Amino acid sequence: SISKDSRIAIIGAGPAGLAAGMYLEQAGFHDYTILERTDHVGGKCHSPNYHGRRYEMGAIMGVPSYDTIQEIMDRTGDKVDGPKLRREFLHEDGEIYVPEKDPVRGPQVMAAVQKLGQLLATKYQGYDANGHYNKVHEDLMLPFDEFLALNGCEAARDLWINPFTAFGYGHFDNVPAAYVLKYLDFVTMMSFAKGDLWTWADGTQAMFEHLNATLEHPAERNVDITRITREDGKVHIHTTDWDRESDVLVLTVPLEKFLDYSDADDDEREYFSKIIHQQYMVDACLVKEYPTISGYVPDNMRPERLGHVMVYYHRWADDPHQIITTYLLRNHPDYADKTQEECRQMVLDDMETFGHPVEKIIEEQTWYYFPHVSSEDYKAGWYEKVEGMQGRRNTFYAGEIMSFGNFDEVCHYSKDLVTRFFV
């Protein structure tokens, strides 16, 4: 419903921004500009170099159901060519164990997982749609454990938790079911269970670097946007080097932060102020005693264990002097934030306990991760409001908050945005 001569400003050159550009271009919208704050593209798909190979400070993997990412690879020529993923399970004291062989718990999990699968296919059909503009069943608005409890499927959490909480998405005691099941829909959960997982030799960042290259208008980098105002039916953007006018604004950046440099209206302030995010910290480590496999720590995914390492990534199996990244969470609604100080010490103390002591941390990042809203705010209609606001003063809303904090979900949402409002 937008004219092709519309000047479109895309904020953010992560997967969501780059995809917005790709799919606008492909629909015949050629006057777009992507504005990126940093000197690089890919956002949280971030793959730096060390000793001739790239490691992952962010996203690592996908599943075969990453249809939109497949479309992106078709465009760039990239292939799923990374090292195969495999894992073991550790207790908080470093003891290796196999949860699948628990005689009492094992059959409980498998019963719940099967019952849930059947409920998802029928009672909750539609749960798995990208975005939240299609209003989900009320049960899905509850925290994941409450959702499970209502259906007698509590034991399902043992399977679902490992690719969720450890991957920094937070805890089932509070994170609403709708987020969990849009990412870990039954097919995706199964793909994780089987280990049918994509990785990239040159990192997840590589294909978005290449996507950028294939664009008619690659991202403008190092753009320090100080002001956006939206009067007279136009979008005026002010940076450090220039101020310029566009017709349409497309946001793939943190929307609560956008409040601080925009003429945000009453609804934007009110609703974007409700956004909560995860403080997810990655440390890239040189280790003595190199693992021979990646490790998960369900024990350390309990809220009572916030700040502890929940998982570590074994990437290059052939070189014991390569990077092993560790993952912990710094926040939870029921607790005060953990300091970077105390969490870094837990990285040292946890890895030594696991038998993989750290010689060096060469890089650390706490990421702005998984923007979402509370079960109450979800129930109160958050996305009915925000999706209802779409196109208001030529501003459109996208990125992680409108879908989910994964790179297929955001790209798929960007694709559909063009379908929903532009064509």
Ligand X SMILES: Cc1cc2nc3c(=O)[nH]c(=O)nc-3n(C[C@H](O)[C@H](O)[C@H](O)COP(=O)(O)OP(=O)(O)OC[C@H]3O[C@@H](n4cnc5c(N)ncnc54)[C@H](O)[C@@H]3O)c2cc1C
Residue pair 407/62 in contact by the 8 Å Cβ criterion = yes
Tokens 């793939």 — which residue? Answer: 252
Binding map of ligand X across residues 184-223, x = CB under 6 A, - = no contact: ---------------------------------------x
- Rounded-to-integer distance, Cα 347 and Cα 324, Å: 12
Torsion of CA 339, 146, 184, 90, to 10 degrees: 50
Structure tokens at 35: 């504005």
Comparison of 66 and 112: residue with beta carbon closer to ligand X: 66
Residue pair 212/13 in contact by the 8 Å Cβ criterion = yes
The closest of 322, 337, 212, 238 to 281, measured between CA atoms, is 337
Query: Under the criterion CB under 6 A, does residue 37 sit at the interface with ligand X?
Result: yes
DSSP letters spanning 250-265: EE-S-HHHHGGGB---
Whole-number minimum distance, CB 183 to ligand X, in Å? 8
Binding map of ligand X across residues 41-60, x = CB under 6 A, - = no contact: --xxx------------xxx
CA contacts within 13 A on the Cβ side of 357: 3
| One residue of 2, 9, 10, 15 binding ligand X per CB under 6 A | 15
Query: Under the criterion CB under 6 A, does residue 416 sit at the interface with ligand X?
Result: no
Whole-number minimum distance, CB 240 to ligand X, in Å? 11
The closest of 372, 322, 1, 320 to 168, measured between CA atoms, is 372
| One residue of 252, 262, 394, 395 binding ligand X per CB under 6 A | 252
Binding map of ligand X across residues 351-370, x = CB under 6 A, - = no contact: ----------------x-x-
Comparison of 109 and 225: residue with beta carbon closer to ligand X: 225
| One residue of 410, 415, 416, 422 binding ligand X per CB under 6 A | 410
Residue pair 421/2 in contact by the 8 Å Cβ criterion = yes
Region binding ligand X by CB under 6 A among candidate stretches 13-21, 79-87, 230-238, 376-384:
13-21
The DSSP element (H or E) to which 54 belongs, if any, is strand 53-54
Residue pair 183/406 in contact by the 8 Å Cβ criterion = yes
Whole-number minimum distance, CB 410 to ligand X, in Å? 4
Give the count of beta carbons closer than 10 Å to the beta carbon of residue 417. Answer: 24
Query: Under the criterion CB under 6 A, does residue 132 sit at the interface with ligand X?
Result: no
Whole-number minimum distance, CB 255 to ligand X, in Å? 10
Whole-number minimum distance, CB 2 to ligand X, in Å? 21
Binding map of ligand X across residues 167-186, x = CB under 6 A, - = no contact: xx------------------
Query: Under the criterion CB under 6 A, does residue 17 sit at the interface with ligand X?
Result: yes
Specify the 3-state DSSP secondary structure of 184: coil
Number of residues that bind ligand X (CB under 6 A): 36
CA contacts within 13 A on the Cβ side of 294: 21
DSSP letters spanning 159-195: HHTTTTIIIII--TTTSBHHHHHHHS-HHHHHHHHHT
| One residue of 8, 10, 24, 61 binding ligand X per CB under 6 A | 61
Structure tokens at 95: 């003891």
Query: Under the criterion CB under 6 A, does residue 402 sit at the interface with ligand X?
Result: no
Report 257-296 residues binding ligand X (CB under 6 A).
280, 282
Whole-number minimum distance, CB 3 to ligand X, in Å? 25
Specify the 3-state DSSP secondary structure of 16: helix
Q: Interface residues with ligand X (CB under 6 A)?
A: 11-17, 35-38, 43-45, 58-62, 167-168, 223, 225, 252-253, 280, 282, 367, 369, 399-400, 405-408, 410
